[model samples]
Target: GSSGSSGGYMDLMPFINKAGCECLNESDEHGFDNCLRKDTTFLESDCDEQLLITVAFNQPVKLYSMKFQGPDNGQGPKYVKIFINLPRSMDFEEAERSEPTQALELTEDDIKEDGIVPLRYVKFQNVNSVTIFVQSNQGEEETTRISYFTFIGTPVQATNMNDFKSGPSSG
Candidate 1:
């Protein structure tokens, strides 16, 4: 598990839709929709020393862990911060003032591994959205690349409650 295993994997892709998504410096070649893909060259963007990504869901989600693949070499990301329920306009600015829900000091060995990084589940039990900020890379690389991205979690327990709602009696 390498200290990051979620102890289980519940793919959240089924609940994802990219209609209102945002990522800094996204490219058609890199593919922002590549998150659910495996072994595909992930969405890449030229780095301005930082990258910000904001993702939301129609309902709350219980996030468990994350699996990320960047270039095997130094082009991969090296530092990252995760925040739950962060606003769309917020970036590292707010992150600077407040502690991240979970932060990682990544290394080449860290990004190159095939294991997922488990998160602090308690902080994410009712997350409607999450923002991930990539701080920097080794040597402060000008280009940041990722091959794949995935999150493991369960949908909020009440997601299907509306389906079971009772309607007024026809009588």
Candidate 2:
């Protein structure tokens, strides 16, 4: 496994729900599936430079950081807004105006190095889903591209004691 050198963080790909994942304004051939794999394939926007991607997880997770890789050109994503555990997937209009749980402005060095962008951990506790809005690109490009994307986090361990079965009830 080609794991990343994150600080006390592990890959959360196993928890992702591929069927539930969706990306808006994606090109026909360039699909979001490519983002899940560690390869040359990439996901690109269709109509414009903006793209909205929603990722669902089978289990709750505590997000520590995220990593992205794209082309060397200025088509890579720049400004991004992250929303966690939304009640439902949002459209472009809704995503444009709605406030994000955390916002990020990625640098060229980040995309260039495929570096990890550490998030505000406290704001991302108990997240079952995450939505990333790529508002713009590094330069004035017609579209945005992301070759690989993954989250670095741990599974949320729920503390539920209801499963305990006593031999007999005292009452």
Candidate 3:
């Protein structure tokens, strides 16, 4: 499905710094791997249904939306909280109390069909990192599973100063 009127936005996959990305409460074996890839493998919560995923970008970007894909079963994420540019990734206890940049409520169709969820464009300008917290799952299962997810945004263009010459100055 199309996210209406994206304007200059594009897929932010190339900009993702996958090495810096981290996931909390994820299963040791089925952990955060190839999260942007569309495949059968998924990131599953380890201890509980709650999960925290931090996605770092190589450069600043203006985030527009996100698309999530998960199993058809009820283990998909339901309630979510989003935060941007945190000094460090929050643990379960910290995430529980920390205020998020925005909150989202996902439906069965959203996870199953890879529905695009839009963000507050104004609040997400010049973002370098994004953190997603899964507060609960649809089936109240012990774990939440995510097959794939991607961000949509435009990279903030850097100013080019190649035209200017380094002139000698008199002391």
Candidate 4:
């Protein structure tokens, strides 16, 4: 019902730019780069479906959004998609009940500012898992290089809420 824990986000560096690589230049010019790559196996095997990733930065940030790149098995742009698992009590079969949540998109200003970017949210309704697909507009052959990746486990309750209460008797 209430939001989960407070601090469970993890930083992951999945890839890095090659020295003097021109791909970085392309990223700066085209607003997208081809240097993004990530290993989904880690997420598939380790991440808990209840966890939502909250990416934090040194300064306040306004996030426009984010999308998950699909498996890189030489197929093609997987049509970026996110799957949410429906509650078990609902009755519909897992295949029939599952639904896709809203996709996040970030504006230039939002990306420039520094703050936490919430990849997605985990709720009781969806207790299974979520998947992110990488869809490239450039073409099916183009592969984005994802260097860094991060994950967060289910949130914990915050103990400081009482500090915000206001009353004459309150110290």
Model 4 spans with C-alpha error above 4 angstroms: 1-80, 86-99, 106-116, 119-126, 137-141, 153-171
- Per-residue lDDT of 34-91 in model 3, one digit per residue for the tens? 5567765777766776778899988998878877657656677777888897887767
The TM-score between candidate 1 and the true structure equals 0.73
Q: Which stretches of candidate 3 lie over 4 Å from their true place?
A: 1-8, 158-171
lDDT of 1 by residue, 88-164 (tens): 63465776786778877666555665646677778888887877777776567886676656667777674322222
Worst 10 residues of 1 by lDDT: 158-167
Estimate TM-scores for all models: 0.73, 0.83, 0.81, 0.30
Per-residue alpha-carbon lDDT of candidate 2 for residues 1-171, written as tens digits (9 for 90 to 100): 233333455668767888999878877988877866776587877677678889998898888888865765567777888889798786788887789988888777767755677898899888988988888777757778887788887878843222212344456
What lDDT does model 4 reach? Answer: 0.29
Superposed on all Cα atoms, the candidates' RMSDs to the truth, in angstroms, are: 11.2, 11.4, 12.0, 15.4
lDDT of 4 by residue, 61-159 (tens): 221234333233422222333333423112113323444464443222222212133554433222232333333312344443332232333223323
User: For every model in order, what is the number of clashing pairs?
Assistant: 1, 0, 0, 24
Model 1 steric clash pairs: 4-118
